[model samples]
Target: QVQSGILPEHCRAAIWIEANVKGEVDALRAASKTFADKLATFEAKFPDAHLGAVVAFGNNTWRALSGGVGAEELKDFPGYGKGLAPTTQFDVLIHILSLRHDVNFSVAQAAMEAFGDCIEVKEEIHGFRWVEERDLSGFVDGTENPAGEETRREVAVIKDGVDAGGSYVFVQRWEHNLKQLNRMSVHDQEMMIGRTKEANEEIDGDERPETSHLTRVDLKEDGKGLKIVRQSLPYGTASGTHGLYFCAYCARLHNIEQQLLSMFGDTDGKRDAMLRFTKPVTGGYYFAPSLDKLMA
Candidate 1:
């Protein structure tokens, strides 16, 4: 709850909601105050399921609700590029993660019941941990994630200043062109991902392409490497429409911004090669507050 899903889960339901009551800010604020503890109560009822809930407020709503006390860099998601990452920022993000699908559904339903007429569901996406935590692209998602629990918290939770202990949350839904990707050779796919398909190891420096997905997203400056905790998962219909529910929690917004700039070709004139096979359908930005501050 505090670290925004610090631990991994088998399945996740990310629900984005908006205030349908229009100018009733007090009702929305009251709903926010009770929702977390309500979910916590539900989580306590099912310890075996390991169900967890995290709520994050949208940019403008957070400011209004928190009385100007909020994450410094929190803002509405700016539509990044033509199609690389589009923006559809919502008023709030409710994340329900758990080991069992049944519990995940039950917890998410409980979460939705709290809103009443104060908030409206904008969009909801269910994400699953694919085999070996691999994305639909067959590459291991979050292979670059920080190894230790403390390390992950260090990378994702704000260190100091306002909203300290809070995490910057970014979520994007991407649809893949699997039919086209299926035609590509494994070698080509490996080259694009800049990793061995079988071993899942990063390709060496000179051997990897600059436009590869790994190269574009990996950011560094002043001899320091910027890292973020990623909890991405696969979501889709059997054979109809499906893609990735991309989620990243970070300590700083600029770090994620630079990575996105690189992916969308704003950093340099080159786009990530992996984008050829997938494109974002919706994206948003939110800030999950520290549990005490949120409940207070």
Candidate 2:
């Protein structure tokens, strides 16, 4: 798996690894503990891997658990340790879960063995590229994304307070069939994404249509108008199961939810532009507190 030069287009491919742990508190707790323990061990094995975790509590709580090794973290995760590493977001989930003893073997097996659906959630923030708005699909994904370093100052919470030394992170792992995606004309692809290739001119809010299945889920900022910062990375396997490890944070979940609605377009499950091409089945919200907790 020679991941030579992936280009900026294919970044942000992983999905948020969420669970209804609250619903199954005990099981969730066990899973969490196992995840932490294995995660630590996993890091040890991959020393260079840039890993981070977040946990969500309803709509008003969150935290960051690991990685954040500064922007110039290690160049990358340990080489797939052979072809064992997967590129899809779910593939990474499989690799991580396989380390846990409590997780059902069958479930973990199924995750890796199956050609699962692509889950799209914009909330997770593992890393970001110098993208000029447009996605690999041609249309701009975040034409509205705040500008200048000002965005980091205004939207990100790298220190303390409500956002604290904390900010929101959204992570997702995307898998692309380039042949299929490229099959469409650049013009058609641009239309599919609802943006232009040139200046990233928006396709007019009313006229701009979502082209992907997950496009419908483009969420709006929540009640407080808090914005999020993303630091995403890419991972994958030669076997075709590679994507991003999606993660994102905000002081509150509800605030982020407002954004989720805009992204998922689950307005009663209608008008979701992303839904046409992506499907998120393995994710849930999590909080990633600041370094204070990390040191403690």
Candidate 3:
């Protein structure tokens, strides 16, 4: 089996970093190994908390991590150039998931320290367990998530080949316009998300709109709707910026890329209405290989 750390947790720490100097990639490699090793110890220390981590590499950083080898679809984040959306780039990504916020911090900070002065901290977003699996928007999130361990492996981990057990991750930070969202009626809000706020039921039949978020992202390919493992978390402060750290792990990057294009309305030209209220600020594509590959 692959590292258990990439599995979802109630609380998460998404630490995004970039190499300060080009030569610092080697330092990142050493730090990542140390970080992974430390995670095993932390997992033992906090029996109540499930602590696990995965290190991801950006387009350029993959060369550093694998001696010039790179995943086919693993490229720099692209600018959607639609609505208010824009792309943000970084060289390294460390995602730490834990049941306890304290453990999340302890392990993440230690890993950051291991990086030393070779990298610059871009952003550290802490995602907390919200009300009963709902996002800050109050509607149930990840409702369509696939269940069971075998399903997780089929949906997330690469099946076979050199990168077997790895995952292609798409990370994005979004900012929500809660004020605008709150101004709308419950019906309008539900229409935007394609689900009822209270019951979290799909607003299908005559109620669902063509531009609904659920309609757009509830995509199908090869006779089946594509499903990816979403380990997203809501983050931010009351007085300042707040939104979800959109983290998704998939066996193939094409599934995610296709879904994102639909969400942006690039595919059908009917942009998801949800984008009107929530906007993406930063994002990128990274390959999180297995622990064995990283250690090797």
Candidate 4:
């Protein structure tokens, strides 16, 4: 298996919530004053613990909410004291369903649930779903992800050079077209993916093949075998706009650089099938340091 550290042994589900508030457009603006008071609340919650948050606006750009909250006391901010307008402007992604003895899952759930419900903006996006290892077509997806010592160097900490010990976080919100996808027959589905459920043979990497998004993104025979750990979760609505908030990370941006270019860049445009089915609305890069020495 991979050496990337995960606090939970068996994560059950990721809850997601999103909605756009109508009629009352000034609520979030009014609440801005109160939300500021929570900075102290968050810091007090975990004085020595590291905390980070990301806030995004239109056109797929985002900003980190808290730099790195080492203090537990500041974890809870009163709430956005002011109201935000233009509909559905705020979103939260919580890492729930931890089944580790060292962590209190119930406490995490209860607190997050309350915090979620406290948003002043009527508009929000949220829900919860299980993260099975299966692909959209039902075969295992990460069977080929990096493992062993390589995981540590690629995901947890860099053991090699100038960028040693630093890591990178990649976040993208993908919107899936289920109706067009599900209409196809199962065999067609298998063909679309270019991987047999029974034979398990992936479509060859180099061929400008007719493959699915997943196949196009599969790691090819790079010298290093491509290294990035995925922490993706399914999310969104039943009425419209639903998909995965694909979160992947590694110690080197180039690893992802190579992977994405191989899948989508002009150098290999035909190899990129993912964009045909899924559209990424947000793109960002962040630094995640070892817990012992996170970005302060």
Candidate 5:
């Protein structure tokens, strides 16, 4: 049950594809193995770059390809429209990442070529680090991810039986209205985010608003906090549509599901304060299985 890389990388390129013709199981297996070998060889060349890739399957695709055995909670992307998140489904997701943009591009090229006619390329998003890993909103992103290698693996990978080392993935492309958000003062923006803009420090608990983005997502139940491994990146052009490329992996889908529910006001009728200025343009749900499962 060796897992596909789910850890953070400095640069990322994600491609969403759909099956033009259904049930190409042998084609998919053959292509994925070639992709796996390519990624492995290149990653070994730049061992320090943390280069990696993953080929994940959508719910319908997984069910068909795996003979009905897939992630227990896998499903189509959900719409929490009370916040602008829409549901968009794709059959496959290919993610390539590394410290160098060129390497990421090279890996992405391999993915497109590997799939060939088995899948139709849909959306391709190339994401990068900004201001030393800050979101386009001028705030630090993924600050809440669990620390350490073991902790991250625990949070991102399935621990038990059949699907061990697999991950339930959620991806969304958000488009922010920069003009509207930039109108506010730093103090106001920090309050909305529940963290200092420049320092990236959390606000005093007493002063943090109920609708603050951090407050809404830092959920707890039975004294244990829900956590996800976020590998998001800043993307899009400065002048055109630009925002965050949201990507997260979790052992339990409910961790992300609950966060979205809270963000959309399903939990307490209070929305995440940050959503007022950003709207999700694309979304997909995927099950990134172990490398053994993905390549076979």
Candidate 6:
């Protein structure tokens, strides 16, 4: 199976890994087996809950795992322009998705336990659907996400062998400045987001500003609008650190990167005003291989 389980009805949690691993071929293989086995067990035990895992490796770790066989686009995450936040590169990433928080957490914990000696748990972020699927900013999120499984497959799955069934993922943690964003009048907020607040409709094209987020990210390559399947969710607290867990899946890494470049103003040199209130804190590029590849 290609782990076509990214979509679920309820909640999800992302468990990230940074490897401290140094071992021989046999030891590394054994650790991989142990981690994969635990993930499978968790998936089977919670059939009603959707469970999925994807692993992306750092330069050295990728060499170790594939014996130097690499994907054409598999590489470290790139840094962006000023104030866009720096990217984080790690040895490994283990993303677990489930329908409930408890189940998601348990599986993530087990994965860390199983790979204890081989990897370090970097950051564990829990994601949930907000009220009416709106972001903490009170605006609808992922409004343009691809809708059908076939559409998702078109956007997310690699169609050939080697890395077939695998998808490239762009993951980032953005911290929102709600105080600043909320301080603006509703109309001003709408202008920045390029959408009406209550109605959730995009502002008229003529009414939108070039610096609006909607204008910046809704980019086109060639004659078509570039698309990626977004499974992102809002995460954060009132008086604490808060923002979105950005997870967009795609067959080509460029789609995500291009949109990001647009967001950071690298594309048109007109910075998105939305960035003034929200900033990326951490980010990385990852590859989610098919279930069969893991089991093998």
Residue-wise C-alpha lDDT for candidate 5, range 4-63, written one tens digit per residue? 468654444443333332346557777888888888888888777678777788887888
List the candidate 5 regions with Cα displacement exceeding 4 Å.
8-26
Put down candidate 1 lDDT per residue, 149-173, tens digits, no spaces: 6787788877777687788888888
What TM-score would candidate 5 get against the native? Answer: 0.93
Q: Backbone collision count in every prediction?
A: 0, 98, 1, 51, 0, 1
lDDT of 3: 0.77
Error of 6 at 144 (Å): 1.7
Candidate 4 has an lDDT of 0.42
Q: Give the per-residue lDDT digits (tens) of candidate 6, residues 45-81.
A: 9887777666555555666676566466878888877
Instruction: Compute each candidate's TM-score over C-alphas.
Output: 0.92, 0.47, 0.93, 0.55, 0.93, 0.90
Better of 4 and 6 by TM-score: 6
Best by lDDT: 5
3: Cα error in model 3, Å? 3.3
Instruction: Give the residue spans of candidate 2 off by over 4 A.
Output: 1-144, 147-150, 158-163, 210-226, 237-239, 243-245
- State model 2's lDDT: 0.36
Candidate number that wins on lDDT, 1 or 2:
1
Candidate ranking under lDDT, highest first, comes to 5, 3, 1, 6, 4, 2
Stretch of 10 with least lDDT, candidate 6: 7-16
Task: Give the per-residue Cα lDDT of candidate 4 at 292.
Answer: 26
Residue 228 lDDT in model 3?
92
lDDT, candidate 1, equals 0.75
* Candidate with better TM-score, 1 vs 5: 5
**What's the distance in Å from true for residue 182, model 4?**
1.6
Candidate 6 versus the native: TM-score?
Answer: 0.90
Model 3 CA lDDT for position 223 = 91
